[PDB]
Amino acid sequence: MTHLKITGMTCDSCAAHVKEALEKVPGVQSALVSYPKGTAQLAIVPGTSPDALTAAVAGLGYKATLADA
Numbered sequence: 461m462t463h464l465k466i467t468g469m470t471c472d473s474c475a476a477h478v479k480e481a482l483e484k485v486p487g488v489q490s491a492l493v494s495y496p497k498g499t500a501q502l503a504i505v506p507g508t509s510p511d512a513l514t515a516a517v518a519g520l521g522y523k524a525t526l527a528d529a
């Protein structure tokens with residue numbers, strides 16, 4: 461449900477600082493980002509909009525899309 465795909469740089473750097481920024485957001489338990497896949501598995505509290513986290517990543521200067529497939 462809440463696993464997004466990263467596009468604005470997927471390598472092992474952005475897929476880590478994004479995790480940091482994500483985990484810095486209250487309501488986030490774990491941001492399971494995978495660089496060799498380009499996937500962000502967000503373990504957030506229900507209620508936190510997926511598009512909001514995606515927007516947070518977008519506002520982080522990177523690009524992601526809420527796409528569970």
Ligand SMILES: [Hg+2]
Pocket residue numbers: 468469470471472473474475
């Ligand atoms: Hg990268």
